[PDB]
User: Which sequence fits this backbone?
């Protein structure tokens, strides 16, 4: 109970959606000694510092592309949550090397810095877009995930543990559908923009993911890809609940966009382990000091899966009717 | 076409490289063919076996931007075949694969723009479509960089394209070859990872050929995919081993049962031709291109909504006897 | 002037950037306006609010020389407004401010010379005159690099100048704005660091305007300083808060009571004009320039020996009522 | 008494004016175990090695712009005196990036290397030109000073202490006024070069600064800017003492040159602390482990100053008539 | 006896001639805990892994030009054998910077990484071509040798020992004379290619050098250049034994090629120490913690040499008639 | 020749540098002479002693590729004399010597090709022939890089050559000078490392002269070696000290008894001329050159099979009296 007290925590990209929520959640429910925000923008950092005004907060201006900076930033840290990233899919397609340096090289430097300072546990934030990806963004994340899982071999001094938490779309996420679908029904417009008519997506909220990351910390062994069992949803209904009775047009599919987001690839189901509310995709490689992922640090037992499993926002065992959506801003 | 043209090929000492060089020397009027790779052993041996004035050997690494800037001086066409492709080794040495495949792509691109190369073609892999293993992910990033490189318009308009296809028959240290050592060593059985395991098949010479056709029709920005046949590994074993039992083992670190060539989610960007496909860019260039009409004036048509080129839902297959014919 | 010209502005998503872009789109025939900054969030939002074909968004960092070399290809004019300007945060993250403000200046300069840009203007600050805080020191180094860059004469003669002025009224997260939240939140008092605290005032639009005039008259090597009015913070509080007491607090980490625009020690290098000043270079270029006569044929005269443009010994002031008028 | 015995000392730019004098002063008056000279030029190093021929001397060829080199050079060092620099003001104006890489980046690498090797104390040499500067040289030094003072936060392992010692013009300093004013009155020339007629400067000697640095070591807490109370002087008299009865011309003010050098800025007087023979400008930032700069390591008590103080070679409470000057070569 | 058990060994360029042989020799005759192969090519690594299939083998894909990679690769290593190199003389002449980055910079990074991880002993492979060299290859190796010998000064934490083993031509070495002279007499060709008629070379076999390296490990103090007393041979006879009765032509001298390879330079004989079967060329510099190279770690006593000595494949006290050659493939 | 030409010399503040600059200013119509070195002290002093408009001083390090790219803009000829030459100090600081001598060579070369310099001459040393000490080894690598640089043929054909010769009489801090302090300080004896110690001798002015002739005759790829006399150190001591005993000490860290100029193993690549030698490249360039005929139409002949230019088997010697004449 409370396996995070007196710990110093560093979170890259702490000024973002997840970052701000996660930090709030840690200051409010744990006796963590210190929380360090690591990000580049001075504007967002000065405002987040006023927004929080907490003595246990520390802010480091820095780029994850900068190995030397991370080395100093992680000095004394026990836990690192890595959320820094360039996630705008269509912008990543026009600015590929940018997305690559931040997400892939960024992951490398963070891993490097965490080993040098002997951090204890590291959780990297992945995305559903990183499974059987088609867009660059998702490919960088897949590479990112691979680096973090692979980092569990290096048994130098202390044994830093690296795990990955993968989930998708976050409701109302700044710049997402909800925010725009809230400016449509609102600012009179008799036509709701729609890409496809079969378009669906996994949906989870900021707080759910945050809470999920914390629980993942409490049970990780290191090497896991944690996937939460979340409900699917068709964009048609997100345009009915968040849009009473208004017509809809069609602008076709956007760049490197899927119709359905995979969560647990059919090609890797033989590695997945089911649990009551989450999954564990085991390493596709073998470590020197292997672990049994069937028994979390929280004794939660895991079951294997059908050799033809494919967790997708398409064949999910649960959905969310319109009215449910409205039950959240 | 290539007469009086200087061509540089990274990874020139590899399986594709040697076949490509051999084919260029014999069928074009290329003035100079440059091999750019790291091994002095392979290059001296490739120099002895290719004793031709048209060759020139450069020792260099694609991870070295300065070296490439220098090697690409005066080059008209660049074929990028340098890579780390061993999937398992890539899972264990992930950063090495990333440095070579992704940063290497970026450097090659940089050096080509600076030296004002006319055309560039990077070799992709079917493992880059909806990838699940690291190697494939790095190639997908590579392909993306190359397609994206076409938004530059400084000195001369450098064109970048990608040629994607799967496993090459007999390929230096692959299934078929080392499999023959099996049915040749009296082996009481043949190793088979799975029964429903299928794969696309193309010969080393066909790929080289396809790369050369792609050069003749490219506008810059395409991912050329050749129409090739699939094949169940069930029959590949019962080809090199007509009479031998199979040791149904398991799946390797990052293998898939079926390799994708053109994803369903990208189908809409596809265009069918008689012999191949073109997956259109996902981005809009400062200057539009009409990929429905090649430089060879070939017309291509869109594909059905939920189309997909997989090694399992393919209509062209290669049975036992059909194999031998190659090697 | 700017018709059919390509303009690139670093830090294009900032307060100055957006105003400058808006002003360029509306008043010139610029063919293409390029925003170069790091945040995808701000750029996508700035793209939605500026839905114009003349725009182009590049994700990049000024600390990245390779990225700039690429972004500046084909650019005619470069406005450098990228920076880390939060003084306190600069005192705590000194190396970050140095990397962005100084190394960033050096890279921008390098990329401009290589791409043969015609004119470049970097935004300085009054905190760079006789500086006492790190941020200001980095800008002074920046300004020096830019002025010095004019000794190059390779391909095309690239001109580098500097535009220096102080605090911008209402500026995203500054005194005035957040101060209104005060007199708006019934606050029983207004935070005042000191009583004799004065500062120069200029509007976001005036600065943008001044930058554009500077482009029209620059020879390359000047530090253009606009004639703007000072203002006691005593009256700024008694403007947004006609009836509210002041919480006379203390001085922030690296604040000064009065900001200098033109130092006394540099007075001799100054030249007065009707609307502004030009602080002449401190070095002699391979090719002399006569800064007493702009490209707009405006004549400027020297100033008195021990002259000095301070926010305290200024003859132009902005009283309470005078403020509101802006925001 | 003698809080420097058995210590290994490294001094960057040890082949310079201060360097050579400081090294002499340390070999002669302390039982320091070893003194390492860190600089680039082989000529000056081979000659300094013959000039000293001391077994406790070590010479490392290296550039302060080279982080890897410093890392190895500082291995085993207890104290680092940082005197390497590009100080020629007019040359720094024509070669700005050069001055920036050596003085600013140089300071960074030295700080980095000192932390990695867990040095105990570090003293950086500043200049009066770094206060309310106008020339690039002075701006780089101001940046340099800022980095060294800011380095006292990092409480990793050991607590390396970083302080700055700032003073100005050194009499007869190679290439200074004295050396030229000694070639004038000498090599017949009926005209002494003069910039301004109100020109003044703070004056101190090599030995005084050196001794001042050593004493600063004995009392520093880390984070201080030590300023010695030194006498001012008008260039007119330096042209009378060092020049009997000879006329004088005027070549105006040189590049980025001041008429008067500030030592303690009016804008920062509220941070200064007076002592019997020196001042302490406290950090403009707050550290995690704050110190009371009113009581040196040598118990010397400090007094605050008038909120309108401005220590300048203009309003100094002491000057140096011609005859005094002659009392020194 | 067996001063190598339970040790973790890393060998750069382990996929080469020496590498493969050395690894075989270590797995077969020592209780070394682990052997790490460090090299770039995935092809040669996957095949060497099948060729050995030993659990005590580890393979790291990496470049010696990459300092960060070596740092991680040497983590936990006790002994490093450095055999990675670009040795093709004529290719090094056309690709000089390539040879320089691999051999010289490569040596530096390996030394750097070995110090950071506190390895115990390091042996670098040199060549006879590095003594009084004329070709670039040999010059890089000379530089390489110099770095490794010079690395014995740094007395940071543990005292890593660096020695160099220098010998020349290896019989039948892939791509050497034997392999081609085996394709001549073989594949009918009435003319054997010959450069000069006085051409001679030192000859040793793969196994001899390997064994020599291991024994060098057992007796090194650190700082030595070990040279084995090996037999000379004239290329004329290598063309009689490996070529019964066939004529011979002359293609003159190839690029940067010598007629005779020096082993122990006349200019350095005063540093050499003779032993029953090997020599020791002492450091041309003095270390802080000097050693007596006259008494190996194996008590083997060494004798000085004549101040006019010149060990060359020209004045050797032993040769190898044709028939002897045939006694080896 | 050099009229209206811009010349840049690295290590321009050194013994060779100053003499070379002085000689260029006085005997050519060079439009601009650029000194590129690191010390501000030496450069300001060299500026005061050389108060000439034709000079220009750049502070820079040869280890800095970016700095060189900039300094070499607009340069026609480059003389590379920057180096770390103190043999003992090189043995103790091996990586520093390597960075300056080898990487420095590579950067100078890179910057020259990019800025399209016409001719480049790097100063080598006799310690680079069959070297035994680190300094010499680094120079041999340097020479190799320079000779090899001639295989480039991008924009303009840049020519790279090498000038090699030994110890310079009186040289700032060498044998002769500091030796005079001896016979001047009444010293009861003179330090002599060995009795059979010989060395080549050339004056500072002769070397400079030889470099200028080399520029006039070079094709690019040569190592010019001047015919200079040897000298026993036995007589050099009995010159500055007619009446003084010798303290027969020992050999320094990396000394040789006799310095080689042209190795026996390279003899075959040599060519004799009236006043000098040319050691031909060891590699074949994309475009052959006939080094038997200079640009000054001088004819050179091969040398005897086992020829070798050593300071011991030389036929030209400098006796006691012969020395004084210089210094
Ligand atoms: N050749 C002789 O007869 C001989 C005689 C005496 C001494 N030696 C010395 O002994 C050493 C080994 O010689 P060898 O005969 O075993 O030659 P080899 O068969 O060419 O082995 C060299 C190995 O080094 C690896 N390598 C090359 N560049 C590398 C780099 N940049 N980073 C990491 N690994 C690299 C190569 O593996 P990858 O291609 O997979 O990178 C190659 O397998 C050499 O240093 C040589 O100087 C050789």
Assistant:
């Amino acid at each position: 109970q409370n396996m995070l007290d007196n710990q110093t925590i560093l979170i890259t990209g702490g000024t973002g959606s997840f970052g701000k929520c996660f930090v709030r959640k840690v200051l409010d429910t744990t006796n963590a000694k210190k929380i360090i925000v690591y990000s580049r923008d001075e504007l967002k950092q000065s405002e987040m510092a006023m927004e929080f005004n907490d003595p246990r907060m520390r802010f480091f201006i820095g780029d994850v592309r900068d190995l030397e900076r991370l080395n100093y930033a992680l000095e004394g840290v026990d836990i690192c949550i890595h959320a820094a990233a360039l996630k705008h899919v269509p912008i990543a397609e026009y600015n590929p090397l940018e997305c690559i340096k931040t997400n892939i090289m960024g992951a490398s430097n963070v891993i490097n810095a965490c080993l040098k300072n002997a951090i204890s546990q590291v959780i990297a934030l992945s995305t559903d877009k990183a499974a059987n990806p088609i867009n660059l963004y998702g490919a960088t994340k897949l590479c990112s995930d691979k680096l973090f899982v692979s980092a569990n071999n290096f048994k130098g001094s202390s044994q830093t543990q690296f795990s990955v938490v993968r989930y998708g779309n976050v409701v109302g996420s700044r710049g997402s559908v909800v925010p725009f679908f809230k400016k449509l029904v609102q600012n009179k417009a008799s036509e709701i923009p729609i890409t496809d008519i079969r378009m669906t997506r996994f949906w989870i909220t900021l707080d759910e993911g945050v809470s999920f990351v914390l629980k993942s910390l409490k049970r990780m062994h290191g090497g896991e890809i944690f996937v939460p069992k979340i409900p699917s949803m068709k964009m048609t209904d997100l345009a009915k609940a968040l849009a009473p009775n208004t017509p809809t047009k069609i602008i076709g599919i956007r760049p490197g966009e899927k119709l359905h987001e995979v969560m647990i690839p059919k090609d890797e189901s033989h590695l997945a382990l089911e649990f009551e509310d989450f999954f564990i995709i085991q390493p596709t490689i073998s470590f020197q000091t292997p672990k049994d992922y069937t028994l979390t640090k929280l004794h939660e037992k895991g079951q294997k899966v059908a050799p033809d499993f494919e967790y997708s926002s398409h064949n999910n065992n649960q959905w969310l009717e319109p009215d449910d959506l409205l039950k959240l801003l």
